[PDB]
């Protein structure tokens, strides 16, 4: 039979599923489609370790996505002295250990501020590492957009949350 859909958490307004690298090709192809949509909205032109989490609405539409990947370290984002008479941020030079890199996170614009992103990050923390629940100090975000920095600081409850650029 056709493989089962991997539901992580379920809610009144949808469910969070996850696509893993070893899943069927139609699933991996759906994950690719969603990543292309997200990169396009971020303004980017164009493997065996990323997991794609999707928030699926009750109408069976993917209205949220979070692409997660293993990492080993990340860096605290720091405050920059403002210029007196007026986009790059500076991070700590001391790396801190981290487990899960949030490479992309996206919610359909008309459904933002409904805790879809927060619940997706909860689902990642609960399912990324078998038998464990990751703390907010074990996750990091890649080069956040302004939206992402506002989300991440609220979610992790600190201004200096963990950041990384990309796993090469």
């Amino acid at each position: 039979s056709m493989k089962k859909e991997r539901v992580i958490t379920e809610f009144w307004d949808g469910k969070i599923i996850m696509v893993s690298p070893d899943d069927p090709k139609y699933a991996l192809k759906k994950a690719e489609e969603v990543r292309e949509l997200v990169d396009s909205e971020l303004g980017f032109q164009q493997p065996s370790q990323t997991r794609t989490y999707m928030f699926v609405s009750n109408e069976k539409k993917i209205v949220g996505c979070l692409i997660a990947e293993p990492i080993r370290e990340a860096y605290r984002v720091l405050a920059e002295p403002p210029s007196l008479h007026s986009r790059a941020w500076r991070c700590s030079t001391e790396p801190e250990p981290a487990i899960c890199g949030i490479s992309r996170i996206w919610v359909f614009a008309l459904m933002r501020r409904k805790a879809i992103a927060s619940r997706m990050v909860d689902a990642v923390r609960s399912s990324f590492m078998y038998g464990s629940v990751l703390t907010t100090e074990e996750i990091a975000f890649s080069d956040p957009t302004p939206d992402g920095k506002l989300f991440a600081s609220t979610y992790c409850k600190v201004p200096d949350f963990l950041v990384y650029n990309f796993v090469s």
């Binding site: 909205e41 971020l42 303004g43 980017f44 860096y75 984002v77 986009r87 790059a88 941020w89 500076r90 991070c91 700590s92 030079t93 890649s142 080069d143 956040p144 957009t145 302004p146 939206d147 992402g148 920095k149 950041v163 650029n165």
Partner: peptide
Amino acid sequence: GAKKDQYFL
């Protein structure tokens, strides 16, 4: 172009 900011040491 891209909406992601740059983050440096």
